[PDB]
Symmetry: C5
Subunit: 197 residues, 5 copies
């Protein structure tokens, strides 16, 4: 089997609209790497950031034997199921800056790392101090509760040319629940502690 | 039945372009806005930029399945379902949907759609910097379906603490509009956001 | 016949790319703007940003069905229908459609499309801050269909009370343009919005 | 044959991705508006009708007993890959993306375009005015595949612009690149304009 | 064989989603930027807006045809062929392609793609209003294909009407690797040394 055969197989087997549960939730790993802080407004409490959203999960149906073939291919995400992640305090659409390609590994692991520019409503107070501001970004599945999707977290790539610098990034698991229903929604709370240089 | 079987059944039965009227009764659409943010307010132009969750529910009993030994809910892309053609009458920008365009379908045939929307409105911003605050009225209804086809029924907890504004009161009242040409009435929800600068 | 049957039949007979000329008659397109808002006015650059409902009606008799014992109207996405290729000649932005892109089809074959449009125009903004106000003229017609293929016919109630501007008068007059090349005439409606800044 | 039959036939015969061979493409700009001029950055924002004609004989039909012209979406036709070499924004097509096809196989496409250009704005606030040169040609087809031929410059120009047109000149030209022997044909449109 | 036949054959054999690796060799992608214009420079935010031609070439031997008695080159929409998934690592906007999205395919299987791109970068703008000027570094490589799948090789048209002038452009090969994995990603580092015209 050559690359074309693996890709043909993935396209004919992929169910983009069907969460690939093995009765277990799909374990989605999410890690933000901050690349840039572009605009900060201490009056409106708004930030414009660029981050790589490292996103991994498993779809065992996509797996193939790679003893005598490539163990990884690039696949357009429009061909694959993708977690329906959203940032709860986003105030703009995520602008994906990068090619919308995922990597599929022969064991069925899927890796997606879009570079995203997005605006958030978060605490910008203290940005011009030594201690800096702490902007909290909550990312979770919009429509899949904890029995369907679990979200697990895990300044190296931050631009030296930003007016801001990063003091600390903290990535903590959290859970939200609504008055209506017993369903809990898992999220990652990403705490970006940063300040003006 | 697994998730794929429920979704294939929904795909084969759902007619995205056909309102699911039972007999000649209207489809009862529930609409509830939850305000998340007030981003830009202009007291001179009377324009406000808001973020809200538009909780939208209705019934398509043709989609129903037995969930005794199966999942009782799935996520479905809205392009596979009929969705109410709701619009805000006093919007001055396109709705920016911030969230994945998936609905939930429940085994009893309930459909639930909760987009997070950023949109700009023309409304009364006068008094925003006072104690009594401003009252901004948002009218949401079906653009093309009169009251015999769609009825719209209404029903601070999630408001960002980091907004420059705070919410005093949200009221959701049912209302109805009619045009000189025709006897048809269009139902809407009038959402009254009473808010002020902190 | 139920709504699904009417919609199936419309999709089978509708030719979105084919003007529905009955005999070899022009398709009579009715156009009526209802101004909802005036957002930005620049008296120096002579530019206005407006919101209007473009009430647009025409006949496609091939879509007709018997509506004794069926619904006499349905909502249909405009991507399933032929739609007039109307353009504003002094527009300087693309029309931003604010509303769902659904038309109403009546069982006699009448089609009604009422998009809410935000668009920017180049027009006369002089006098906006006076009592007599400015008169901004918007020219709307078919871009590619001359008068033997499309005729365009015209016909403050919904204006936002919260605008900084107020409407004194709207006039809708039929007009016709012809180009040096060809004998073909293009019909338009000239919509004259007389408005001013409030006291 | 009725309109539906002409359009059905165009869908069966048209190859949007195949140049209908050089194809002689006629290009003529009519300036409608000058919106923004910046003397410091040498940038202009203009609105123009790009009158574009060519022949695709494969589209032809007998019109003795049918319409001799139809409107066709450009996504159904081959269209010249014309670009402005000194554009600094994407062309914003303001108008419905329909061409006219004549029964002899002539195609006419007249988009109204808003676009920003890098060009000489020096003298704009003088009596002699500025001369802004806009170079339009095929991006990927050299002169053996596409030839570009030009055709009252102020007849359609908005009276409400802060600017006025003194002269529009449309001259044939050619570009060639260090790599290759191929020549690319262009029209150089010289817009002589000034502040009122 | 006429143009229609060549294009039909390209559509029948081209796999837009499949990198055309020959044996187990990487696809050699040649990338060369020609700067056309510098539009907006912000010395406070360290942001530039530039227009450049991204000359992109590679080989897809599956596309090849006999051109002894037919055209040796055609224009093909990029949606009909595989295209390298190049991205600028310090881009802060989507690339805005200003030009028709057509590649040239040569009968030997050579593919040439030259989009005119407007894009905003985060890079060092300090010194732009000095004699030595600013050096803005743009890193371009494959987003998803490591060095065993794609290799990136580097290899006059600047508007005379820009308020900036170009002192030097240097194009150097480089390689990145991530803590997770052994895979290396090739890039080109393009160094644009430029400054404001007309300083005293
Ligand atoms: C090539 C590249 C440029 C920038 C960021 N990348 C990354 O961050 C990672 C990465 C991912 C994880 Cl889960 C952990 C770590 Cl430590 C690194 C990575 O593999 N790649 C290549 C890829 C691009 N798209 C996909 Cl899918 S994989 C890059
Ligand atoms: C996960 C999440 C984030 C934000 C808002 N949501 C909500 O408001 C509700 C919700 C809906 C109703 Cl009708 C009543 C109540 Cl009390 C709550 C909800 O279920 N969910 C998940 C969903 C997202 N899209 C669909 Cl469809 S369901 C969330
Ligand atoms: C519900 C609604 C909100 C706003 C404007 N509308 C209108 O102006 C008219 C209308 C149309 C005409 Cl031809 C004459 C008159 Cl007097 C009124 C109308 O019927 N509707 C509903 C519709 C929306 N889209 C279509 Cl198609 S019909 C509304
Ligand atoms: C109706 C209209 C509004 C604006 C500009 N138009 C034009 O300039 C010309 C035109 C074209 C040429 Cl080649 C020479 C001359 Cl002298 C005039 C024209 O025929 N039309 C209609 C058309 C629009 N799109 C197509 Cl295709 S044909 C108009
Ligand atoms: C016509 C044109 C306008 C602008 C730029 N172009 C170029 O830069 C080059 C070019 C390419 C290389 Cl690899 C080296 C050199 Cl030295 C020049 C070129 O051939 N062409 C035509 C083409 C445009 N798109 C394709 Cl595909 S071929 C132009």
């Amino acid at each position: 089997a050559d690359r074309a055969d693996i890709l043909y197989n993935i396209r004919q087997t992929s169910r983009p609209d069907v969460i690939p549960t093995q009765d277990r939730p799909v374990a989605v790993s999410v890690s933000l790497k901050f690349i840039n802080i572009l605009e900060v407004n201490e009056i409106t409490n708004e930030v414009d950031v660029v981050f790589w959203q490292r996103t991994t999960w498993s779809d065992r149906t996509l797996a193939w034997d790679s003893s005598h073939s490539p163990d990884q291919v690039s696949v357009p995400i429009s061909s694959l199921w993708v977690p329906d992640l959203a940032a709860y305090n986003a105030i703009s659409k995520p602008e994906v800056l990068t090619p919308q390609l995922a990597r599929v590994v022969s064991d069925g692991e899927v890796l997606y790392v879009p570079s995203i520019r997005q605006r958030f409503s978060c605490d910008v107070s203290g940005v011009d101090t030594e201690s800096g501001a702490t902007c909290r970004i909550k990312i979770g599945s919009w429509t899949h509760h904890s029995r369907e999707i679990s979200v697990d977290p895990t300044s190296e790539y931050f631009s030296q040319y930003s007016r801001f610098e990063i003091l600390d990034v903290t990535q903590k698991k959290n859970s939200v629940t609504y008055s209506c229903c017993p369903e809990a929604y898992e999220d990652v709370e990403v705490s970006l502690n940063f300040r003006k240089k």
